[PDB]
Amino acid sequence: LELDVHPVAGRIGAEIRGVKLSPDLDAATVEAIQAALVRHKVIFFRGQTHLDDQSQEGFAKLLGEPVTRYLLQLDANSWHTDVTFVEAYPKASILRSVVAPASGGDTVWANTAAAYQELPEPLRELADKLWAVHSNYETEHPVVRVHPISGERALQLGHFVKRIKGYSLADSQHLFAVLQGHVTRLENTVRWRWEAGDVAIWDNRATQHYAVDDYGTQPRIVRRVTLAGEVPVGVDGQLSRTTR
Amino acid sequence: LELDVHPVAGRIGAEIRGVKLSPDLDAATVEAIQAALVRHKVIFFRGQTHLDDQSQEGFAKLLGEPVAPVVDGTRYLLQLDRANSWHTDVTFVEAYPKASILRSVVAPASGGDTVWANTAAAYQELPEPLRELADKLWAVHSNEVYETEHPVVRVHPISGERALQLGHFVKRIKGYSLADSQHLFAVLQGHVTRLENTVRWRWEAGDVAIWDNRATQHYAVDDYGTQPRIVRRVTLAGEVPVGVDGQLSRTTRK
Amino acid sequence: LELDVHPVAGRIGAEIRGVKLSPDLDAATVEAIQAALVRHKVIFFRGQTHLDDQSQEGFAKLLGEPVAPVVDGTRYLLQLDGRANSWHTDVTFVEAYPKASILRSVVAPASGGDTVWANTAAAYQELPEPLRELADKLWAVHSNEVYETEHPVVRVHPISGERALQLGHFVKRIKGYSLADSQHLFAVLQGHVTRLENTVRWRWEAGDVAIWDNRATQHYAVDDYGTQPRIVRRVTLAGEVPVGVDGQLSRTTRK
Amino acid sequence: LELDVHPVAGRIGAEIRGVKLSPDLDAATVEAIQAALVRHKVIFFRGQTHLDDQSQEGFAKLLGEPVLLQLRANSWHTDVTFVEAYPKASILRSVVAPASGGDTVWANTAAAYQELPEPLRELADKLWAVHSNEYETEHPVVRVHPISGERALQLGHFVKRIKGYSLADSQHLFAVLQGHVTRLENTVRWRWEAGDVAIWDNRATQHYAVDDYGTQPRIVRRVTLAGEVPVGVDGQLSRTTR
Ligand code: NA
Ligand code: NA
Ligand code: NA
Ligand code: NA
8 A cells, every 4th residue: 555645855754645534544544654654754644624632532543552532732842752751752643733823833853763874883883872861750761762663773862861871961962962963954854834634643763853932922722642652672672761 | 015925934934925026027016025025034936937047037136236157048147956054145255145036947856945044033032141242243254265254243234133144154253262262153053043043945846035145044955865956046246244333344365 | 468479370379388377377477368369369388287177277267257077176177088070169059158268188199189270260351351241241050959049150259359250060050041052151151260271280298288269269179099098178168148240149049 | 120200190190200311321211211101191300400402302312213492382282193103202391481380281192092981982993083284184083002002092183173074073072082181180280390301102192381471481492203103993094185
């Protein structure tokens, strides 16, 4: 099954046409969606005007286990991967625009697998060995996560990082600056301008995101379902662990 | 005259609909375009598939004085076919361009975007003590050899808006150690490229962008691999920048 | 009264010879020591092998009001025997932090164990004027993380009138700036503090005593001596609430 | 031979007592000085007022091949690293020493390497840098010392960039590794008196001359010894490019 997929930026993001999202999509469409999600890191569905607080939650149930019973209304201008201060942080979120500012209000995603891949080999090798402490609850995650479906390596960083374990503060700051700077390099990002009825789904294991706070008092309302994820595994196979 | 203007991001950029760019636009249209340009910093016209090399050039002349190896059949049109580094155009000279008019001839199916940053918005968000510091700084800009000393803050000659004048031609902040120069640049340039002060455009063949080079920087995203990307540009002559205290930029070398 | 004063580095630090520190030092000598302290920021007295715990505490009371688990047989003497290898001004997470310490070497490593002081008045004075003007307007939050205090980045010294940067490792953030801006501005200003020309390094021998003006210095204890014993004993003197260039006072915001 | 050696800082520097430097020192003494030089990275001889330019150079010829120059250098560097075979050592004598100020600081770039966490040493072992006098040379960031085998960071102010990285990454990586070099624990500061002589191993140090003495006269006289092309951890050699 080939969906009608239209890449949005060169290294991340794709719009999927011809699909009305619903709790009654079959296992095949769910699978082609999950595959697009893995390949493109964030996928977009426009015109899901037909969709409702309950029909979104039951679409979401098809992709994983939510963490209406689960649909959260939001009514975040810092680069982050969702909830990384816990061990088994979410694998994905499904986000629907309900009220969209007429100007401003965009979201940007970064591809943390592309960010890893473009590092020179010596720097990849260092990242492979690093651990970082994330806090809001404190958890140690490897800086490089091996993705449990695709096998792709991805940088696990973002604003919940308090320090790189084993380094002085100065060194921690520099090493984080280098690696996070590859994540947010423009080439690794896609920016989406929302219209009501849009739906984005992103793979939280291989992205970061940032909500642009340029819309002043214009109302902006989105509704999110977050899917439960796995404990990350590093390149050497060690698992993330909570510490505080 | 009110053009059909649609802001693209919150702090920068606007698409103008209902206008067919040409050398024959009337005074009211040209004035409203110039006003939108100063207000929005970068403006976009989609669907200009009628606009050819000569017409793009004749249109550009309604906005200013084009400056110049050019596209055949023109005197000023430059072909670009990468600039993935934040900059303000040609700031290593004293009277750098005021504007460019850029048309998409061939646009990659995925990737190829351009981002602009509003350097007036970036100035305005600085805490007051940092604004006051920025108002006193001068920076050396270079192509390395031309070098020019510009004020860090330029007072726009039409709007009076203050704008940071930085980007990748900056060699150093004058009068500071190297370490200090790097830190102060990082702070001020960092405000320029903050996402909130930026607009990203995804090109389609026939799109035209026009930007105010006095109050922007821009960056061409190099994410499109070998997909052809061909754009053609006319650059318009600008003025010698004036700082907050009235002092003028000056070339200091070759 | 003119002491026998020998500058150690060009911009900070001076050894004072011919003086035996004690609780009975006369007022003219004490006054001259106070002046030398303000001028030189850290002063050094070698060969004070007669000084014992009680006589150090007694001497210390001549220069100020000691502040207080102390060494036995004293009220205020603190033993440090490890490590403070990070640039700081003492206790700046409180509002009225110490004005001075009097530190005596009891056991000094045969190699290593130095202390370095930086002149934060010299650091301020070397900033280009626009940067001095910015520094004059900044405030920083200092924290022991739990106490936090807002201090101006520039302190006007209450004796000399000299302006001095008030920074170091207790600084959590520069108030009113993003994290990234706070980091860069701290790095610039702290970097002038630790520039080598603004520093003096002392290698300790048992019976050495150093006195420093904590209002116009930072210091760093070099941790290069491994397991060699290092024991020093310190009396800290109470200080005043700092005053900024515009007259505003520091303020504690959490206690 | 056991010289009377007195370590100055914890991780670098030693004063050597009871030796009058001259062209006539015996082989046992010269060998012991060379050993102390390699161990301590910089060594100091005080009271060498009997020396003059000729005698300083005769003594220096016992340690290597000269390439006396009379001498502001307040920037951390290793000497002339913009050339491929930069000096192995210098011998520097104080002729006039300011009464206050005028110190020199050395850093031990072998200690700086050793203290890096293992993953960061492994990265450093793989990096190359371009050094320039703006003459440009590519040197490994880690040099394997040809006598002791100790690994040492080869950085300092002649570095223009770390090869293969963006400007931003090069800046940050340099800041990290150079920051370990100049960490106070890896340094020794010397206050000069006329007649003092310092000898340092330019393969495993950097130095900085403190500019705090105003217009006080400061006169030093230096003899520099020729050195070898550096070898990196993988055996590759430095190479001049421009
Ligand atoms: Na989020
Ligand atoms: Na450009
Ligand atoms: Na202290
Ligand atoms: Na030199």
